[PDB]
Amino acid sequence: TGRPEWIWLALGTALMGLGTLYFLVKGMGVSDPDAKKFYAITTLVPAIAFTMYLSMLLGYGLTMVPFGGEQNPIYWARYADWLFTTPLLLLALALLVDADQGTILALVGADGIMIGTGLVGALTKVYSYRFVWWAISTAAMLYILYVLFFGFSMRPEVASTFKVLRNVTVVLWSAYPVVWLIGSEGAGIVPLNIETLLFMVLDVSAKVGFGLILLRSRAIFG
Amino acid sequence: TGRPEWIWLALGTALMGLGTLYFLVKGMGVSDPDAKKFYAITTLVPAIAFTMYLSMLLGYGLTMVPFGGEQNPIYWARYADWLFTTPLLLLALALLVDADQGTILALVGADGIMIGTGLVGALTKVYSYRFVWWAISTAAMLYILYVLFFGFSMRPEVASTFKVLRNVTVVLWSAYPVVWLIGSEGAGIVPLNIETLLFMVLDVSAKVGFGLILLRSRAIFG
Amino acid sequence: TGRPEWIWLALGTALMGLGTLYFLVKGMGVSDPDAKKFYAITTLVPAIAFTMYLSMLLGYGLTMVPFGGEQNPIYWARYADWLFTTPLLLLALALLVDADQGTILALVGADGIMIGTGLVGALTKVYSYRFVWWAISTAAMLYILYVLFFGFSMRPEVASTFKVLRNVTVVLWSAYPVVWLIGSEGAGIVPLNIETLLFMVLDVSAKVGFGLILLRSRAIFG
Ligand SMILES: CC(C)CCCCCCCCCCCC[C@@H](C)CCCCCCCC(C)C
Ligand SMILES: CC(C)CCCCCCCCCCCC[C@@H](C)CCCCCCCC(C)C
Ligand SMILES: CC(C)CCCCCCCCCCCC[C@@H](C)CCCCCCCC(C)C
Numbered sequence: 001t002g003r004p005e006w007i008w009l010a011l012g013t014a015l016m017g018l019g020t021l022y023f024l025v026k027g028m029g030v031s032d033p034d035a036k037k038f039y040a041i042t043t044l045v046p047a048i049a050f051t052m053y054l055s056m057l058l059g060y061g062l063t064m065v066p067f068g069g070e071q072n073p074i075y076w077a078r079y080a081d082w083l084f085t086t087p088l089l090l091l092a093l094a095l096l097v098d099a100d101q102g103t104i105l106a107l108v109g110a111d112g113i114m115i116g117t118g119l120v121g122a123l124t125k126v127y128s129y130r131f132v133w134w135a136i137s138t139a140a141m142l143y144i145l146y147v148l149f150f151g152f153s154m155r156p157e158v159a160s161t162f163k164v165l166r167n168v169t170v171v172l173w174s175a176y177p178v179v180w181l182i183g184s185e186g187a188g189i190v191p192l193n194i195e196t197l198l199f200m201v202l203d204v205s206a207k208v209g210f211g212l213i214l215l216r217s218r219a220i221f222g
Numbered sequence: 223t224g225r226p227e228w229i230w231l232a233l234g235t236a237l238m239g240l241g242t243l244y245f246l247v248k249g250m251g252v253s254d255p256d257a258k259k260f261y262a263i264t265t266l267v268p269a270i271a272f273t274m275y276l277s278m279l280l281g282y283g284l285t286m287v288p289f290g291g292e293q294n295p296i297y298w299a300r301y302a303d304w305l306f307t308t309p310l311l312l313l314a315l316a317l318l319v320d321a322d323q324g325t326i327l328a329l330v331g332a333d334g335i336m337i338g339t340g341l342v343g344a345l346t347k348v349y350s351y352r353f354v355w356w357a358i359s360t361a362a363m364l365y366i367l368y369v370l371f372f373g374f375s376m377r378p379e380v381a382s383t384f385k386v387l388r389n390v391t392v393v394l395w396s397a398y399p400v401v402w403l404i405g406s407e408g409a410g411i412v413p414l415n416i417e418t419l420l421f422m423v424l425d426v427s428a429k430v431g432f433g434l435i436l437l438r439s440r441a442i443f444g
Numbered sequence: 445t446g447r448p449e450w451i452w453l454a455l456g457t458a459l460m461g462l463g464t465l466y467f468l469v470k471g472m473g474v475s476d477p478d479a480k481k482f483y484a485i486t487t488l489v490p491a492i493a494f495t496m497y498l499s500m501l502l503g504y505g506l507t508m509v510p511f512g513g514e515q516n517p518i519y520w521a522r523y524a525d526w527l528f529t530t531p532l533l534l535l536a537l538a539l540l541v542d543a544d545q546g547t548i549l550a551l552v553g554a555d556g557i558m559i560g561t562g563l564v565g566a567l568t569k570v571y572s573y574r575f576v577w578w579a580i581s582t583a584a585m586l587y588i589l590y591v592l593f594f595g596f597s598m599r600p601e602v603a604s605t606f607k608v609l610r611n612v613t614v615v616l617w618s619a620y621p622v623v624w625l626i627g628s629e630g631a632g633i634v635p636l637n638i639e640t641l642l643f644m645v646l647d648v649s650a651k652v653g654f655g656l657i658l659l660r661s662r663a664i665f666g
């Protein structure tokens with residue numbers, strides 16, 4: 001269509017869809033209780049992103065936000081997506097290391113505050129206050145990364161596999177507040193079409209890429 | 223009022239309300255931990271549907287959606303209702319057979335994608351894309367029904383009782399995408415007032431009817 | 445600003461923020477699994493209220509609702525806040541007395557119906573129906589208070605500490621439907637600026653005040 005970023009949303013739609021079918025097929029046969037949970041998560045996440053990428057693609061998951069005296073296209077569907085996939089991602093890391101419930105609850109709550117305030121910042125029409133919501137969101141993200149780094153006698157296999165995903169998580173997740181900031185939602189240093197491209201690359205990395213990593217470990221099996 | 227379907231929403235309001243009081247009364251005295259969960263579920267579900275039927279009844283849970291060049295009344299309150307009652311229904315079946323968490327999470331996630339995309343399809347103004355969201359929703363429903371059918375040494379009583387509800391669930395739940403499709407949200411083969419009637423009959427069947435079945439079994443007791 | 449109630453939202457923003465940092469600091473070092481959950485809850489709750497008080501403060505969490513032939517300012521952000529903090533509050537009481545899951549689910553579901561219908565009543569433009577939603581909300585609150593009072597061999601320390609919070613909960617929570625009723629959302633006996641003040645005093649009492657109580661008990665430790 002006219003939306004130059006359409007190509008990226010259409011690519012992202014396809015990769016998430018293809019990833020869901022892949023995990024769906026691979027997930028056939030798992031009987032192991034524990035392995036089951038990881039499989040559930042690794043398949044649910046691209047499945048949610050799929051519906052959200054397609055809603056952005058069809059124009060449903062998009063709104064206009066007036067700020068800086070202009071009507072600014074805002075894909076709220078990215079946030080609806082992250083609202084459900086990030087806690088699930090967090091769940092898989094906590095199950096991995098058998099984290100305590102209390103910690104799990106900290107993180108999930110932490111995470112919803114994170115997505116929640118980014119959404120608010122995205123939809124805020126007073127330009128300045130946008131970045132205020134950004135900073136709080138970012139602060140919740142740092143909280144979360146702090147816990148995954150500095151809060152965790154597991155089998156060496158789990159230790160090893162979690163070390164990897166944890167290092168992935170820091171670098172991926174960290175990238176998000178930077179794209180937002182440079183993209184059209186923030187300072188507008190990068191146009192919408194490059195903005196959409198970057199988030200798609202991260203989303204696919206974070207959805208499908210992360211899961212491909214995780215299900216390759218036998219740390220997920222009881 | 224002027225909305226011919228008002229009678230159906232008013233009837234449905236009354237039956238859900240009456241059902242909540244019935245399960246509330248019947249639920250007095252249960253001390254059994256396990257029985258408790260089933261009682262919670264069987265009472266919560268008509269209680270939620272009650273508030274949603276009344277919101278449609280008062281006109282709050284209703285919006286207009288322009289498609290086919292006409293303003294089309296859409297009861298989003300049906301979806302808000304199904305968003306919370308269907309996973310609870312699913313929970314009761316999984317507890318019944320002691321399903322694994324991973325499976326439970328599959329289903330609930332599956333289920334939210336189901337309701338979520340129907341809502342999107344209902345609110346989508348490009349007529350054609352409506353049915354695209356329909357098909358994905360339906361695909362999530364088939365996923366779910368597949369798992370309940372082909373995924374489950376329980377006491378014979380549980381086995382027996384689950385066989386029943388499982389057969390109920392297939393036939394009830396299956397009816398929904400068919401009414402949507404023939405109703406005003408889809409191809410408009412059936413008018414709004416008959417559409418509302420059909421969903422009310424299913425909702426009461428699915429809410430109160432299903433629960434009356436379930437609490438009659440001693441499969442729910444420890 | 446022009447909104448006379450701004451001072452109250454700005455005060456409330458500060459107290460919730462200060463409370464989050466306090467619980468955050470105090471929560472450093474807890475290793476006890478169980479104590480962990482209480483700490484998570486006691487810190488998450490003011491953290492959520494913080495983001496909601498600030499959104500009301502910046503004008504984001506506010507809408508206009510026409511009723512009585514006038515445009516009536518409605519802080520929906522109070523409800524978004526209560527939607528997430530009240531079940532967490534309820535969780536802490538149930539963990540305290542080790543309540544059964546089924547009971548927990550009763551309460552949380554009960555609680556969402558409570559906040560949900562108040563939000564609907566707040567946003568309902570037919571003046572009369574507002575109070576209908578009020579009464580249902582209030583009925584769910586009475587349900588909840590009934591269970592906390594009449595539904596619970598714990599260590600004497602837990603017994604003792606729960607008796608206190610339970611008496612706090614009744615008096616605090618009960619105050620809410622009364623302020624709503626006398627405030628601008630209901631009969632308009634009290635102006636918006638006094639209305640906002642009262643809810644702020646309750647919110648801080650209910651958020652920070654309640655948590656300060658709870659974390660002082662060693663009933664929270666295993
Ligand atoms: C076992 C394999 C081959 C899995 C195939 C699943 C297919 C879908 C997506 C999986 C690919 C992801 C690789 C890691 C993550 C990313 C950094 C991908 C960046 C996206 C941009 C283009 C890369 C090419 C692709 C077509 C995979
Ligand atoms: C123990 C009994 C009698 C329970 C009474 C609870 C009352 C409320 C609703 C319960 C009835 C549901 C029966 C099964 C489900 C359905 C197929 C009902 C279809 C609805 C249409 C009219 C039927 C008559 C009714 C008034 C129950
Ligand atoms: C250990 C202590 C001092 C904790 C400090 C945390 C700071 C933030 C808020 C905590 C205060 C709450 C006390 C109980 C609850 C309320 C009834 C407060 C009513 C609010 C109005 C003004 C009162 C003064 C305050 C500045 C605390």
Ligand SMILES: *C\C=C(C)/C=C/C=C(C)/C=C/C1=C(C)CCCC1(C)C
Nearest residue numbers: 118137138141173176177180203206
């Ligand atoms: C798709 C899945 C992943 C891992 C998404 C992660 C997203 C974030 C970490 C987003 C963070 C945000 C913050 C920190 C700043 C404000 C806005 C964002 C929502 C982009």
Ligand SMILES: *C\C=C(C)/C=C/C=C(C)/C=C/C1=C(C)CCCC1(C)C
Nearest residue numbers: 340359360363395398399402425428
């Ligand atoms: C009220 C409780 C029950 C069991 C409701 C069940 C509803 C469904 C199975 C709905 C399914 C939908 C699908 C499959 C197709 C798109 C739209 C619907 C939401 C009607």
Ligand SMILES: *C\C=C(C)/C=C/C=C(C)/C=C/C1=C(C)CCCC1(C)C
Nearest residue numbers: 562581582585617620621624647650
């Ligand atoms: C901030 C935390 C607390 C404990 C909030 C509690 C709020 C309530 C008990 C609210 C109750 C409502 C009812 C009973 C009546 C309709 C509207 C309200 C949402 C105010």
